Enzyme design. Structure first.
Site, PDB file in Angstrom:
ATOM      1  N   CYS F 280       0.795  -1.278  -0.099  1.00  0.00           N
ATOM      2  CA  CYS F 280       0.044   0.056  -0.015  1.00  0.00           C
ATOM      3  C   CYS F 280       0.843   1.299  -0.127  1.00  0.00           C
ATOM      4  CB  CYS F 280      -0.847   0.047   1.167  1.00  0.00           C
ATOM      5  SG  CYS F 280      -0.122  -0.063   2.826  1.00  0.00           S
ATOM      6  N   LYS F 281       0.509   2.190   0.829  1.00  0.00           N
ATOM      7  CA  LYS F 281       1.403   3.560   0.851  1.00  0.00           C
ATOM      8  C   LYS F 281       2.658   3.139   1.360  1.00  0.00           C
ATOM      9  CE  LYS F 281       2.274   7.600   0.074  1.00  0.00           C
ATOM     10  NZ  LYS F 281       3.823   7.570   0.446  1.00  0.00           N
TER      11      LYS F 281
END
Ligand SMILES: [Ca+2]
Ligand SMILES: [Ca+2]
Ligand SMILES: [Zn+2]
Ligand SMILES: [Zn+2]
EC number: 3.1.3.48
Lengths: 7, 356, 368, 11, 356, 368, 11, 7
Positions: F280-281
């Site tokens: 993800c981020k």
């Protein structure tokens, strides 16, 4: 000097 | 209003906390700590209390946060870690601030700290043997307050730059404790090195008229006599307790110099143990300090003074020190034992000289 | 023991001080015992200790009956308590007072195992209703009890637990024999009639008669009242005991002129070999100021040692602002031994009794 | 107190 | 607003404290504690958590103080002593109250108790050996909440009088844990004594259709069969862990009685250790409890269940218990091993019976 | 040792676990060492532990060089830390992971010395900014690390501390090899041009090139993106790696339909012998949900064991509400091993890849 | 990996 | 039953 005297 | 392990000193303005984490600021709360910037240099297993130099640096940070316009309606929280040793250094340093700056009384600063759980770790000595004597925050607060009342401490006249400079070993390693006494470490001679030259220059410009050596000879005492300072040897073994005849001679020798308006400079090898006994006995003799108050006041200026069995010695002889004010008096005839100074004699021998 | 946690070693292989929130089990090399369920402290308000001399004596007989049990021949005894800091202070202080009074240890010997312990012990506070602002430590109590033993003020071998518990009760007078010279009690109460009934000892209740009977058979020569009149002083004068009023407000501190008159009043009674009985309403606050000042004047107690010794015999003495007062005036009490002396002329302020005067007034009397 | 005081003196 | 060691649950209404002293009431604060009235009977070194019977008595005292008109504008503070064991019993008992009465969720009651210093003492077993397994308040809260969601706990139907009566050894020493199971101690036969007569009367009027004995014979099993209750022996050594074949037989035997609408009564000698393994394995099989949730829920009803190595056994086999729901099914043919009841067989053998 | 306080015995006469607010001195029978000043934990916010696998390896070499020093031949080594509950948890948990992974101890053997200790250890919390409401214990971490070793997921003998510290840095890709099948990293960032400059590997920064180079030489077959587009996916497709988007909001919990598609997408890649890289981020929160669900589905971890194992390799995974989500859906993850199976027909939702279907759909395919 | 693993097995 | 529901 901040005023922090005893009440 | 929702905090834990936080003590209230001033309602909605001053608080003392202790957390194992960094708390976040709020619209009504601002937190700050000095554990990471202002710390205590330990000799062995001693951890405090903080000295007067640490107090001054704490007051600058405290006043800056107090008058920050963003903190106009916030309550300031001074905190530390949760260890009992670090909680004692912060609480005692905050108490000494209200005594010396805000003119609080001992019973006013001790009320918020009483009967708190867990209790604060009592302070110990700077020796190598196992601890058997403890002073409390109540002892240090009463000692700092009594010294201020007698005019021995004035934060307005406190010079932080010179205090930190001359405390270093390279500049002579000394602290002026009172307007009458100075405690330093024994100078060493192999011209002259910088620490010895710094001590001679300071003593010549600060009205030092007597130097008392308490340890074995590590230098030539002529350097003090070349600039017009009387030298005197009252040497006894390092780590031991002085005989009361040595203490009586020291008091009379110092009272003679005090009468003339000069200062006395006392040193053993480190200027902590043997030096603290004689200077501590005179402070109790003059101003009536308790043994615990006297130890706490000396360590507040110069940490590590009075080591090991000297703590119990100063405690069991404090009554004899305050007794000499009423049973003795400065003699009218000099004594060879203190190099021509006037010692202490009882009133019986004194009133005989009065006429005879 | 190796696997034991939160245990302090006093005598290696023999004596240990523990603190657990559970009941430990005995082994072939260890034996555990506690006295929390039987030897406890009665609190006036928020005071928790230390344990008094009656608690130490009861602890000593239990400690001795475990030491000399042949089943515990080669075991190490572990005296323990709960994990609270308040209960760890009473257990450690009482164990130190045991070694001081029974084993003839010095203060620095019993204070070494308790130094720099984490978590630290809870300091003792006063028995007042206000917020605490003054603390005494185990170091103060140990030094105070040790100094009293050196001066002959405490002798546990002549101690009688029977009468100590009896005369501390409210319905028996509520008093303790602090020293061979002083007694602290609570003000007796009575309903004095105004007729012929006021000539017989029938309206006097049991605690009043207990005080009168004990004082008449224990060489009590002077009774000093510090509170308002709750009884008639003639009951003490009929048995040949002098009565004197030095009354000041409850909870307040006495003026130094009252303290000087008290010292002078009690010193001559001591010179005559008698005891002095001092009381306020409860015999704790105002009584502790005067008796405590005389103890410092005589034997050189510190203010902290003096408070710890008084509470070790009679718990709850010196309350509130009287603690800081005794602390700031302790120098004046010991000073009177060198600036004052007993006068040769009696004083009307202490009922025709001899007070303290300066060295200039004294020598001028013996000369003339 | 006594009559059975154990020898617990300081070494 | 100035307290120490106090946790906030509801702002200005509900608080959880821990003090070594009795705090005084105020115009805005009212304090109460149940340590002196509601305590935990310990088997050995176990100290909690409090059972459901202790919860009910706490709710009566809590509700009485809440609706006291003098406390209309006060914040209530429920406190205990400062020991980590007593702080865990109070915090967990306060959490179970909000779960079962105020319909809070696990993450709502666990938020005030997270990351507090000093932490709460984790709960241990009631055995004699040294502890090596611990359940937390998070385990008990999730276990009590899951049981309520499955309809296993209803405080409205809770009868305190009968709960305390039948838990005593003189009345049979049993607790109905779920609407399907009952755990008791082995009856004893030397007519019939009162504890045995009390068990027979209760089982006959509460639709008990199967009794499972797990310990050695201490009575005559005909007394249960005389009143129309099937008896079954699944005996294994006290303190040991049951073989998975015994657990499989127990599940199928209990599922057969549950299908008929009756209850199953299981007992070893004390009804704690061996009884907790089989009943605990069925609760995990039916409702999907975790091993820790299942132990916490059983001790919340009947303290001391699952002892010693049985705790690690229930933990390492919880996946096999939840697996039988998808790999097995009740057989269409009875088995002699469970006295004519229908056991568990895999789907392979089951779909063969479907036609054949 | 007998006179030691707050010390736990693991191996009698050899290994001890202490906790002091001072520096203890070595004796002829004892030797003390600590690693707080050199082996510490980096906090995202208010998380403090536990120590990761790189910390354990550095602790092991220091522990071994003290054990085999001939000067410490007959001494008992005491590993200690500060007295804070947070630092006592990291020291005790790391010592337990040492005996699990190096000395082949069982969980109940390393958890016995740490049971019912006063004061208790501080439970570990998440790395989010909100208030903590979910805790894992040392019992969860020990069981999680022990289960991973039994399944062959951790082998400290093939562990390379050199690359573990290198590829965890932000400027080198910020990733960790959790298992032989999965890799968790942070979303690569780039400024993709729209001209001829977009054909050469010159605008790609160092951490992007480090990820592409490592994935191409370590049998990475699939990249699963869970956050918004911060780079161009063609850079992964040019080196022959499939790219798939399963994007959902940061900090939220994935729908069970996304989790099922992820399990099916990763199971066939495992069937082909390749690795899957999820991000993800930051590669902690959303990445922990999917990889953690597949681990529970495969090896039967508890939710608490799975969180403790992920943080032991990559600290800070599973954040906030994702902890209670993984806890309440762990039964559904293990259930899929018996209610689902790999389909024979590919699915467009996972890019022409094989998903999970019921047992009714599966047998109906093999029959027809 | 190692080459000097001390024998610290559980008794 | 006092209203002590979660805000
Ligand atoms: Ca606290
Ligand atoms: Ca401890
Ligand atoms: Zn009368
Ligand atoms: Zn690009």
């Amino acid at each position: 000097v901040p005023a922090l005297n005893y009440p | 209003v929702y905090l834990d392990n936080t003590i209230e000193f001033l309602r909605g303005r001053v608080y003392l906390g202790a957390y194992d984490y960094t708390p976040e600021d709020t619209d009504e709360l601002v937190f700050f700590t000095v554990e990471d910037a202002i710390f205590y240099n330990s000799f062995h297993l001693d951890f405090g209390p903080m000295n007067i130099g640490h107090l001054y640096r704490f007051a600058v940070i405290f006043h800056e946060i107090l008058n920050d316009p963003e903190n106009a309606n916030k309550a300031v929280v001074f905190y530390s870690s949760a260890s009992t040793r670090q909680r004692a250094n912060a609480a005692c340093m905050l108490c000494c601030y209200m005594i010396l700056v805000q003119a609080w009384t001992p019973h006013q600063v001790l009320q918020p700290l009483a009967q708190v759980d867990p209790p604060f770790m009592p302070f110990r000595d700077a020796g190598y043997s196992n601890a058997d004597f403890e002073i409390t925050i109540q002892d240090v607060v009463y000692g700092v307050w009594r010294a201020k009342e007698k005019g021995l401490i004035d934060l307005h006249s406190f010079n932080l730059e010179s205090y930190e400079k001359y405390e270093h070993v390279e500049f002579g390693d000394f602290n002026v404790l009172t307007p009458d006494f100075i405690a330093f470490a024994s100078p060493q001679e192999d011209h002259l090195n910088q620490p010895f030259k710094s001590v001679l220059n300071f003593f010549a410009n600060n009205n030092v008229q007597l130097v008392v050596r308490l340890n074995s000879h590590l230098y030539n005492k002529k350097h003090f006599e070349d600039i017009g300072i009387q030298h005197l040897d009252l040497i006894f073994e390092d780590g031991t307790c002085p005989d009361l005849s040595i203490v009586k001679n020291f008091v009379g020798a110092a009272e003679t110099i005090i009468k003339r308006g000069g200062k006395i400079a006392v040193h053993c090898k480190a200027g902590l143990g043997r030096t603290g006994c004689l200077i501590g006995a005179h402070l109790i003799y003059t101003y009536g300090f308790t043994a615990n108050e006297c130890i706490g006041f000396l360590r507040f200026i110069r940490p590590g003074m009075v080591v090991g069995p000297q703590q119990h010695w100063l405690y069991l002889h404090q009554n004899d020190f305050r007794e000499w004010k009423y049973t003795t008096r400065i003699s009218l005839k000099p004594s060879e034992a203190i190099g021509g100074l006037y010692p202490l004699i009882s009133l019986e021998e004194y009133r005989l000289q009065k006429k005879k």
